[PDB]
Design a protein around this nucleic acid. Structure first.
Lengths: 50, 61
DNA sequence: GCATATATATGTATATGTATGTGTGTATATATACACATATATATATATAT
DNA sequence: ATATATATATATATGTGTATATATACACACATACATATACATATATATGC
Protein backbone atom coordinates (compact mmCIF):
# COMPACT_ATOMS: atom_id res chain seq x y z
CA UNK A 1 0.00 0.00 0.00
CA UNK A 2 0.93 3.67 0.35
CA UNK A 3 3.30 4.11 3.31
CA UNK A 4 4.64 7.60 2.73
CA UNK A 5 8.22 8.65 2.19
CA UNK A 6 10.76 10.95 3.78
CA UNK A 7 8.70 13.94 2.60
CA UNK A 8 5.37 12.99 4.22
CA UNK A 9 4.98 11.58 7.74
CA UNK A 10 1.25 11.03 8.38
CA UNK A 11 0.39 7.47 7.41
CA UNK A 12 -2.95 6.82 5.77
CA UNK A 13 -5.87 5.05 7.39
CA UNK A 14 -6.18 1.25 7.58
CA UNK A 15 -8.65 1.09 4.67
CA UNK A 16 -6.04 0.83 1.91
CA UNK A 17 -3.22 -1.01 3.72
CA UNK A 18 -2.18 -4.67 3.65
CA UNK A 19 0.46 -6.06 6.01
CA UNK A 20 2.23 -9.34 6.76
CA UNK A 21 5.16 -10.62 8.81
CA UNK A 22 8.59 -9.83 7.37
CA UNK A 23 11.45 -12.28 7.01
CA UNK A 24 13.66 -10.19 9.33
CA UNK A 25 11.34 -11.18 12.19
CA UNK A 26 12.28 -14.77 11.39
CA UNK A 27 15.95 -13.79 11.13
CA UNK A 28 16.09 -12.28 14.63
CA UNK A 29 13.07 -13.85 16.46
CA UNK A 30 13.09 -17.68 16.92
CA UNK A 31 12.20 -20.36 19.47
CA UNK A 32 9.16 -18.48 20.76
CA UNK A 33 7.46 -21.32 22.67
CA UNK A 34 10.01 -20.77 25.47
CA UNK A 35 8.85 -17.19 26.01
CA UNK A 36 8.24 -16.21 29.69
CA UNK A 37 4.48 -16.42 30.27
CA UNK A 38 2.98 -13.28 31.83
CA UNK A 39 1.69 -13.25 35.41
CA UNK A 40 -1.83 -12.24 34.36
CA UNK A 41 -3.85 -15.19 33.06
CA UNK A 42 -5.76 -13.23 30.41
CA UNK A 43 -2.48 -11.62 29.33
CA UNK A 44 -2.33 -14.13 26.47
CA UNK A 45 0.97 -12.86 25.00
CA UNK A 46 3.98 -13.52 27.28
CA UNK A 47 6.11 -11.00 29.17
CA UNK A 48 8.34 -10.60 26.06
CA UNK A 49 9.79 -12.66 23.18
CA UNK A 50 13.17 -14.01 22.02
CA UNK B 1 -21.88 48.68 24.26
CA UNK B 2 -19.83 51.82 23.47
CA UNK B 3 -16.68 50.01 24.63
CA UNK B 4 -17.26 46.97 22.40
CA UNK B 5 -18.05 49.25 19.44
CA UNK B 6 -14.86 51.18 20.28
CA UNK B 7 -12.84 47.94 20.19
CA UNK B 8 -14.48 47.08 16.86
CA UNK B 9 -13.37 50.48 15.53
CA UNK B 10 -9.95 49.99 17.14
CA UNK B 11 -8.93 46.57 15.82
CA UNK B 12 -10.95 46.96 12.61
CA UNK B 13 -8.74 49.75 11.19
CA UNK B 14 -5.18 48.48 11.68
CA UNK B 15 -2.40 46.40 10.04
CA UNK B 16 -0.26 46.80 6.90
CA UNK B 17 0.49 44.95 3.60
CA UNK B 18 -3.13 45.14 2.40
CA UNK B 19 -2.51 43.42 -0.93
CA UNK B 20 -5.27 40.80 -0.74
CA UNK B 21 -5.15 38.76 -3.95
CA UNK B 22 -3.88 35.49 -2.42
CA UNK B 23 -4.12 35.17 1.36
CA UNK B 24 -2.71 31.65 1.02
CA UNK B 25 -0.51 30.77 -1.95
CA UNK B 26 -2.51 28.03 -3.72
CA UNK B 27 -3.81 25.54 -1.11
CA UNK B 28 -1.91 23.89 1.78
CA UNK B 29 -2.66 20.56 0.06
CA UNK B 30 -1.71 21.92 -3.38
CA UNK B 31 1.59 21.02 -5.06
CA UNK B 32 2.75 24.25 -6.70
CA UNK B 33 4.82 23.65 -9.84
CA UNK B 34 8.05 25.57 -10.36
CA UNK B 35 7.02 26.90 -13.79
CA UNK B 36 3.43 27.49 -12.69
CA UNK B 37 1.97 30.80 -13.82
CA UNK B 38 4.17 31.15 -16.92
CA UNK B 39 4.03 29.73 -20.44
CA UNK B 40 5.07 26.05 -20.41
CA UNK B 41 3.40 22.63 -20.44
CA UNK B 42 2.53 23.04 -16.78
CA UNK B 43 0.15 20.26 -15.74
CA UNK B 44 -2.14 20.13 -12.69
CA UNK B 45 -3.16 16.83 -11.05
CA UNK B 46 -6.65 16.69 -9.55
CA UNK B 47 -6.41 13.52 -7.48
CA UNK B 48 -9.07 12.33 -5.04
CA UNK B 49 -8.28 11.98 -1.34
CA UNK B 50 -5.41 13.50 0.62
CA UNK B 51 -4.11 10.02 1.52
CA UNK B 52 -3.03 9.81 -2.13
CA UNK B 53 -0.59 12.73 -1.42
CA UNK B 54 2.13 10.13 -0.76
CA UNK B 55 4.60 9.78 -3.66
CA UNK B 56 2.91 12.57 -5.70
CA UNK B 57 5.71 15.05 -4.97
CA UNK B 58 8.50 12.48 -5.34
CA UNK B 59 8.42 11.38 -9.00
CA UNK B 60 6.44 14.17 -10.62
CA UNK B 61 8.03 16.80 -12.81
C1' DG C 1 45.35 80.15 17.33
C1' DC C 2 45.54 75.91 18.93
C1' DA C 3 45.93 71.61 22.80
C1' DT C 4 42.87 68.66 24.94
C1' DA C 5 39.82 66.15 27.53
C1' DT C 6 36.28 64.01 28.91
C1' DA C 7 31.42 62.95 28.23
C1' DT C 8 27.92 60.75 26.62
C1' DA C 9 25.78 58.22 22.87
C1' DT C 10 25.40 54.67 20.12
C1' DG C 11 27.41 50.27 18.29
C1' DT C 12 27.72 45.75 19.85
C1' DA C 13 28.10 41.76 21.40
C1' DT C 14 27.07 38.70 24.48
C1' DA C 15 24.57 36.40 28.23
C1' DT C 16 19.47 36.47 30.41
C1' DG C 17 15.68 34.84 30.97
C1' DT C 18 12.09 33.55 28.90
C1' DA C 19 8.82 31.53 25.35
C1' DT C 20 7.30 28.39 22.36
C1' DG C 21 7.53 24.68 21.62
C1' DT C 22 6.59 20.14 19.20
C1' DG C 23 8.92 16.56 19.75
C1' DT C 24 6.68 11.79 18.73
C1' DG C 25 3.02 9.34 19.06
C1' DT C 26 -0.38 7.37 22.20
C1' DA C 27 -4.69 7.97 24.05
C1' DT C 28 -9.50 9.96 24.55
C1' DA C 29 -13.73 11.18 22.03
C1' DT C 30 -16.25 14.28 18.70
C1' DA C 31 -17.23 17.09 14.40
C1' DT C 32 -17.37 18.02 9.00
C1' DA C 33 -19.30 18.39 3.73
C1' DC C 34 -21.31 16.23 -0.60
C1' DA C 35 -24.19 12.59 -4.69
C1' DC C 36 -28.32 9.26 -5.16
C1' DA C 37 -35.92 10.74 -4.78
C1' DT C 38 -40.44 10.61 -3.49
C1' DA C 39 -43.38 12.20 0.11
C1' DT C 40 -45.47 15.48 2.40
C1' DA C 41 -45.91 20.57 3.96
C1' DT C 42 -46.30 25.07 4.10
C1' DA C 43 -46.73 29.37 3.46
C1' DT C 44 -47.44 32.93 1.00
C1' DA C 45 -48.62 34.93 -3.75
C1' DT C 46 -52.24 36.01 -6.94
C1' DA C 47 -57.47 36.61 -8.37
C1' DT C 48 -61.80 38.36 -7.68
C1' DA C 49 -65.47 40.34 -6.22
C1' DT C 50 -68.73 43.01 -4.04
C1' DA D 1 -59.15 46.53 -2.32
C1' DT D 2 -57.84 43.39 0.36
C1' DA D 3 -59.65 38.37 2.82
C1' DT D 4 -59.12 34.17 1.76
C1' DA D 5 -59.07 29.51 -1.25
C1' DT D 6 -55.75 27.26 -2.94
C1' DA D 7 -51.52 25.45 -5.19
C1' DT D 8 -46.72 24.42 -5.40
C1' DA D 9 -41.60 24.16 -4.48
C1' DT D 10 -39.18 25.01 -0.58
C1' DA D 11 -37.06 21.63 4.27
C1' DT D 12 -35.77 17.06 6.47
C1' DA D 13 -35.02 12.58 6.12
C1' DT D 14 -34.46 8.17 5.66
C1' DG D 15 -29.88 4.76 4.48
C1' DT D 16 -25.81 4.20 1.69
C1' DG D 17 -21.44 5.65 0.61
C1' DT D 18 -16.85 8.59 0.68
C1' DA D 19 -14.01 11.13 2.40
C1' DT D 20 -12.09 14.89 5.71
C1' DA D 21 -10.84 16.98 10.32
C1' DT D 22 -10.00 18.44 15.60
C1' DA D 23 -8.66 19.69 21.21
C1' DT D 24 -6.21 17.99 24.86
C1' DA D 25 -1.90 15.48 28.59
C1' DC D 26 1.66 13.21 28.61
C1' DA D 27 7.87 15.73 29.52
C1' DC D 28 12.01 16.24 29.15
C1' DA D 29 16.14 18.82 28.92
C1' DC D 30 17.10 20.65 25.26
C1' DA D 31 16.29 23.54 20.32
C1' DT D 32 15.68 27.34 18.34
C1' DA D 33 14.85 31.57 19.02
C1' DC D 34 12.88 36.16 20.68
C1' DA D 35 14.01 39.99 21.35
C1' DT D 36 16.49 42.52 24.28
C1' DA D 37 18.63 45.16 26.76
C1' DT D 38 22.29 46.74 28.60
C1' DA D 39 26.42 48.09 30.10
C1' DC D 40 30.51 49.68 28.54
C1' DA D 41 34.09 51.34 25.27
C1' DT D 42 35.59 54.90 22.41
C1' DA D 43 35.18 58.82 19.24
C1' DT D 44 34.78 63.28 18.07
C1' DA D 45 34.05 67.29 18.84
C1' DT D 46 33.39 71.21 20.41
C1' DA D 47 33.58 73.95 23.34
C1' DT D 48 36.10 74.69 26.85
C1' DG D 49 40.69 75.73 28.17
C1' DC D 50 44.87 78.73 27.46
Amino acid sequence: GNFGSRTVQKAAASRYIFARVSKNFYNVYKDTEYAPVHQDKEHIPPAFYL
Amino acid sequence: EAALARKLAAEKAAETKAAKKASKAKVHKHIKANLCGKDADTTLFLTEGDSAIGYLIDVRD
